[PDB]
Amino acid sequence: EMEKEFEQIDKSGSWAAIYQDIRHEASDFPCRVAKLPKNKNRNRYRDVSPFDHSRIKLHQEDNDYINASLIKMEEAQRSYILTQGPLPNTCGHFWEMVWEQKSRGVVMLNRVMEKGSLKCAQYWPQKEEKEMIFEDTNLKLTLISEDIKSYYTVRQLELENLTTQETREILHFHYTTWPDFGVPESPASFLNFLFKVRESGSLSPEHGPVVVHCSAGIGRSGTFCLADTCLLLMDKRKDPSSVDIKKVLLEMRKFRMGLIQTADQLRFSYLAVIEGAKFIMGDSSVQDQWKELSHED
Ligand SMILES: CNC(=O)[C@@H]1Cc2ccc(NS(=O)(=O)O)cc2CN1C(=O)OCc1ccccc1
Ligand SMILES: [Cl-]
Ligand SMILES: [Cl-]
Ligand SMILES: [Cl-]
Ligand SMILES: [Cl-]
Ligand SMILES: [Cl-]
Ligand SMILES: [Mg+2]
Structure with missing residues (x-):
């Protein structure tokens, strides 16, 4: 049981060892498509690639490759697409994927610039009157509104298939204060944000999988998805004791490499x-407490 295990690990000072055990046991599957020479400029990082078996294939229509993985959690009955921060040449591919996979939400856990470097392209419009057209993938993207909080921003976007003129509302949840290889300021700030995503309906099984990304799409993205799936599993069962967090992480790692990048994460x-x-277990009042503790105003 997770809280008893937590205390034992804390008491014995063994987070590094527990984390290394996970790394040791994690799946290793081929990434042959990712490593094709024609795909070199579609990967942000040499050593972070989608496994072939779980990669998202684009439907257009010349090269189907995007650095993105479907994390399909069978027992939990929830899926996520984890992807790298799009590059200047893959923003059209990114939105093509959102359209084809029928996603309603995009969760972004990094900033465009971190540590002086560009870790993600500016892939969405920052001003209503300056929409983006992805001519390669025949999509248009317009900012409809935004709600700016102290450590996160929610945006309403309209994505249009120029081929058909069909439009969809996409919700963008941008966590702006989660440092790379680091952790959220508190459980409260993280949970307040996670519950904002949940409340939106973006994780509904009636939609495609939410797209979650950071810079590599593994450390911060893995942390987010692990907490969400664990919470969902205990919710379905109303049984916190039934959830084996390490087992869930290893299951997720069948679908993309390197999820959760540090022992502290x-x-x-x-x-x-x-x-x-x-x-989950019925203390409704804690949600307001997290909102207060997160200082979102
Ligand atoms: C220190 N590592 C690195 O700088 C590079 C790029 C990067 C940026 C950012 C990052 N953090 S994230 O944006 O939260 O995913 C992770 C990685 C992983 N990485 C890797 O080379 O990861 C290879 C790896 C490691 C463990 C497991 C699978 C693959
Ligand atoms: Cl940013
Ligand atoms: Cl900086
Ligand atoms: Cl970039
Ligand atoms: Cl950072
Ligand atoms: Cl790792
Ligand atoms: Mg303005």
């Missing part, structure tokens, strides 16, 4: 799930 995941369980 693993530790934070346990904290987030232990805290979130208070809400």
Whole structure:
């Protein structure tokens, strides 16, 4: 059981060892498509690639490759697409994927510039009157509105298939204060944001999988998805004791490499799930407490 295990790991000072065990046991599957020479400029990082078996294939229509993986959580009955921050030449591919996969939400856990470097393209419009046209993939993208909070921003976007003139509302949830290889400021700030995504209906099984990304689409993205799936599993069962966090992480790692990048991110995941369980198991009042503690205003 996770809280008893947490205390034992904390007491014995063994987060590094627990995390290394996970790394040791994690799946290794081929990424042959990712490593084709023609795809070199579609990958942000040499050593971060989607496995062939779970890669998202684009439907157009000359080269189907995008650095993005379908994390299909069978027991939980929820799926996520985890992807790298799009590059200057892959923003059209990114939105093509959102359209084809029928996603309603995009969760962004990084900033465009981190540590002086460009870790993600400016792939969405920052001003209503300056829409983006992706001529390669025949899509238009317009900012409809935004709600700016202290550490996150929610945007309403309209994505249009220029081929058909069909339009869809996409919700963009941008966590702006999650440092690379680091953790959220508190369980409360993380959970307040996760519940904002949940409340939107973006994780509904009636939609395609939410797209989640950071810069590599593994560390911060893995942490987010691990906490969400653990919370969902205990919710379905109304049984916190039924959830084996390490097992869930290993299951996710069947679908994309390197999910959760540090031992402290693993530790934070346990904290987030232990805290979130208070809400799942019926202390409704904790949600307001997280909102207050997050200082979102
Ligand atoms: C220190 N590592 C690096 O700088 C590069 C790029 C990067 C940016 C950012 C990042 N953090 S994230 O944006 O939260 O995913 C992770 C990685 C992983 N990486 C890798 O080379 O990862 C290879 C790897 C490691 C463990 C497991 C699978 C693959
Ligand atoms: Cl940014
Ligand atoms: Cl900077
Ligand atoms: Cl970039
Ligand atoms: Cl950072
Ligand atoms: Cl790793
Ligand atoms: Mg303006």
